[PDB]
Design a protein around this ligand. Sequence first.
Ligand SMILES: [Cl-]
Ligand SMILES: [Cl-]
Length: 288
Amino acid sequence: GVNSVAARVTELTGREVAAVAERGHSHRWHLYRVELADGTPLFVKALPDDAPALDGLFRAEALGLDWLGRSFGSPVPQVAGWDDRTLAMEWVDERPPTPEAAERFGHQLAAMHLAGAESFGATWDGYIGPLPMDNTPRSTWPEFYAEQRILPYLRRAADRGALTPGDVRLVEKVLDALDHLAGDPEPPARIHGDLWNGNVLWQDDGAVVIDPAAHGGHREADLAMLALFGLPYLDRVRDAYNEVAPLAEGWRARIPLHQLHPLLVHVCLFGAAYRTTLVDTARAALRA
Ligand SMILES: [Cl-]
Ligand SMILES: [Cl-]
């Protein structure tokens, strides 16, 4: 990988780079394993030299990692350095999932969430992949979720013709019922914001969470995302989580509600594949 990657990392971290290896791509940026002179490995995301880039994209992740990472036994990687083009962080060597790690990860996530937030949203502009994500601070969840987590992606998907007017009306029924469906107000959590299995890197003693879309959110969101695409030892993670920060009564029934945001993002980003799941989940939320 780039001699330009190596240069940028040294500038940002102050550390000498001994090696760079390519590790593929995600959306609009390239991935690398970068090794420092003492053997320390770093995971590095980098936009190409000269390429135009989304306003505040890398910032959202750098700031989100810093903010999310201030809990005991944090599962969040440490950032070695960043700028609008480059993000260098701790390299994780994955391990197979184990039930022991799963229990420990449950505790890690509970402490992460319960660090708490002043409001829903965040002080920096958000992204979910390459899509804008509205982090405007809000004091109440139903309004935040409807206006900043559901409606923007619903309208976008409808505009692109991935969702029908009937699909839109179905999701709008949920929103109209939201101040019953929501359950009871609780404080905003520090949530990862995109916590599906591919963003969980298993370790011997827990797990590391990567690629956050971090903000003040409902903690049920992260657990619902683990459920949506599944996770090794999901029930052990949730059981251990519930030991230390028990979810509010009726959380299982609310899982579909909390899956509507990610599902709308998927329909936006990836198309029709996820439409029927969105519809089925909306129906399920309505009858929850
Ligand atoms: Cl070094
Ligand atoms: Cl399990």
